[PDB]
Assembly symmetry: C4
Homo-oligomer: 41 residues x 4
Amino acid sequence: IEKQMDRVVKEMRRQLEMIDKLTTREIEQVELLKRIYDKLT
Amino acid sequence: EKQMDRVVKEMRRQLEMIDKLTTREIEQVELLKRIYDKLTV
Amino acid sequence: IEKQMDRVVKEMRRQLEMIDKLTTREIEQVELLKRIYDKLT
Amino acid sequence: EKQMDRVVKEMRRQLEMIDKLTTREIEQVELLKRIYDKLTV
Ligand SMILES: [Ca+2]
């Protein structure tokens, strides 16, 4: 069981990195939206 | 036991990231709605 | 320990629901983007 | 033991959702970039 819980920890850390990559993309999308809005106005 | 505490820690980290992700997604929605109103018409 | 692992399961399910709410918002944003692009073109 | 299998199951579910989330985020980025090019100029 000990070995399965270690695998789980590794996988959660992996998912965090994936969510991090999402967050960077969201930050990009927001700035691009803001720039698009500025253009319009 | 120590493994489980690690699992808990990663989960707490995941929650914080998901909340930040949610905040940014809302930012995007607000901007998009604002852009759509501008264009139409 | 058994009780801590049950708490963890509940929390993961909770996070899933949160991620689900994000996914609905993403689906909305995409359709709104598509509609905005159509207008422009 | 059965608790841990439940944890694993939820984690597998989380991965699938994160991947779907990523796919939609990319869709948004592509559309946004396309919209920005259109506007400018
Ligand atoms: Ca988004």
